[PDB]
Design a protein around this ligand. Structure first.
Ligand SMILES: CC1=NN=C(c2ccc(N)cc2)c2cc3c(cc2C1)OCO3
Ligand SMILES: N[C@@H](CCC(=O)O)C(=O)O
Lengths: 397, 100, 47, 50, 50
């Protein structure tokens, strides 16, 4: 609870399981004491010792009378503890960081050519302009037999680069050599720009985000892990399905260890790791974290399986049947679904954008070329300002 | 005015017009508009060459929740079937929407 | 290790100055040739 | 398209009070633990995958 | 695949398989020994590459 440091007793806790425990206590009529598990693990039978840890250990060894907690009903646990009928159902899901905040920069139109090419294009433009002035304008031995002053030279070379032509063309031999070599340069550079832009806009489609849990087994660029001592680790261990077996083999041979002690550590790892690491988790944990800030996450692909949550009791305990009956009654009454909405859907503040799904529409957006419009309007304003200052100077003098 | 409309139309395509600004601020407008049209035309042809390659576009339903919001695609189950009964009793908000 | 199958997905990356370096050499050589030709014609017509 | 809307399976059914219920429940459990269910699922879904 | 594919992909004689591959626009492949493959590859019409 927000005031758990000051509250005492069961008032310190809140959530789906706390409300479910309250409803179960009300229906059956017993008093209950909510206790945090000392081990921290969900539960599994340790190798070569058969000692159950976590929840199953607490239940079997007489430490606890009931476990109203997100426990997945599994066959290997039914042999030592008794579960109630599934009060909620889910499946194994896949967690991965969002593709990218790949928003195009304002000046993203300069991207197809490196900064050095633009710098050297400006330098080559200045050099060609100055040379085309020098070549066409020193004495023929009147001398002004052509219109290629320095300003007209700059205009001609700028027009030649943009492939828009110009009102003049060099008439001497050496002026024509300059024109020809500049024409070849601008042809090569414009073709290269178009070709490279097409290359980017094409290979930006083969991105093909991973899904279906089969891409994880197919490649190893994106690492994935599983909660330690959880039922998902056992699910991957026991399963003989080819894709699940392959992911099991990789995660067993992968180093450093991909396991996380607690689910929160896994969430932090997958959030921080540049989208390189994936987390294998249950669907409800995926869909709740998906709906909570910073909301840097989605849920990808369908559920890997179908396993339900149940309230577990020590084997042979008198609490098993009444609690199971209460769970079934609440399922009939819809209190379980109501609490599901209350704690999953009623805590949402989404959102639901940037899915890059249907939304994604080729039709290149304005944001990709928005810099060109800024340059255009800036140039228009500058031209009006230049005309005004020229008019003022030429009228006042 | 009409000659300038023709020029700025001629400059957007790559067809050289029969006049040129010949002043300083006129040449500034001409130059910046030439750069704009160069970038836009190159983007159009590069994007088209991107699309004519590669396929696997469009999808009507992806999240199984869009059917509750969309109406152009009708959806139904087997009559007197278990799916019909499940929709008939489900209290999930989105499932209740589709059932209604 | 392993390449995935043939994917090798990545950004295209921008053309470096090495890719179009030759056209700049062509251009500057053209400017040098043009200045040489202009001066040759000027000196020929100065005699 | 999309994921599973619900989560429930397919089960062998008998009329209420039929003596056949317990043996067939034992049989389906034995098949599940023997992996025969997976073999039949492969034989009827994945072998004809062309 | 060869056990599940229909119609039968197997051939009675090697020459039948070679003719099948040549006539089948490249949609059919033949499985054969390397040395005998080297001989068919080196004789006309010589459109057969390993
Ligand atoms: C976010 C990206 N999106 N825009 C273009 C781009 C460039 C020009 C125009 N008109 C439209 C779009 C791009 C092209 C690239 C590139 C990076 C980018 C940035 O690296 C290799 O070529
Ligand atoms: N709640 C699971 C932990 C792993 C999982 O999310 O499946 C368990 O009871 O072991």
């Amino acid at each position: 609870k927000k005031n758990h440091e000051m509250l005492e007793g069961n008032e310190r806790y809140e959530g789906y399981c706390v409300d479910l425990a309250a409803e179960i206590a009300k229906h059956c009529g017993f008093k209950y004491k909510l206790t945090i598990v000392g081990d921290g693990k969900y539960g599994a039978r340790d190798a070569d010792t058969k000692i159950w840890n976590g929840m199953v250990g607490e239940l079997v060894y007489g430490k606890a009378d009931i476990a109203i907690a997100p426990l997945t009903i599994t066959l290997v646990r039914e042999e030592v503890i008794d579960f109630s009928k599934p009060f909620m159902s889910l499946g194994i899901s896949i967690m991965i960081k969002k593709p990218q905040k790949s928003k195009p920069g304002v000046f993203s139109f300069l991207d197809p050519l490196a900064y050095e090419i633009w710098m050297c294009i400006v330098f080559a433009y200045i050099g060609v302009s100055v040379v085309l002035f020098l070549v066409s304008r020193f004495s023929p031995y009147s001398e002004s037999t052509n219109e290629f002053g320095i300003f007209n030279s700059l205009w001609f070379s700028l027009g030649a680069f943009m492939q828009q032509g110009c009102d003049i063309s060099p008439r001497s031999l050496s002026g024509r050599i300059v024109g020809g070599v500049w024409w070849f340069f601008t042809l090569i550079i414009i073709s290269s720009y178009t070709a490279n832009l097409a290359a980017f806009l094409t290979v930006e489609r083969m991105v093909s985000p991973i899904e279906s849990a089969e891409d994880l087994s197919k490649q190893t660029e994106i690492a994935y892990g599983t909660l330690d001592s959880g039922s998902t680790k056992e699910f991957f261990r026991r399963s003989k399905i080819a894709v699940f077996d392959k992911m099991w083999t990789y995660m067993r041979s992968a180093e450093p260890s991909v396991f996380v002690r607690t689910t929160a550590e896994g969430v932090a790892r997958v959030r921080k790791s540049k989208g390189k690491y994936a987390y294998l988790l249950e669907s409800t944990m995926n869909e709740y974290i998906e709906q909570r800030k910073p909301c840097d996450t989605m849920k990808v692909g369908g559920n890997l399986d179908s396993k339900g949550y149940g309230i577990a009791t020590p084997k042979g305990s008198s609490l098993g049947t009444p609690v199971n009956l209460a769970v079934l009654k609440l399922s009939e009454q819809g209190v379980l679904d109501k609490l599901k909405n209350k704690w999953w859907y009623d805590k949402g503040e989404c959102g639901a954008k940037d899915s890059g799904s249907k939304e994604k529409t080729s039709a290149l957006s304005l944001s990709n070329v928005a810099g060109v419009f800024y340059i255009l309007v800036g140039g228009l304003g500058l031209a009006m300002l230049v005309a005004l200052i020229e008019f003022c100077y030429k009228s006042r003098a």
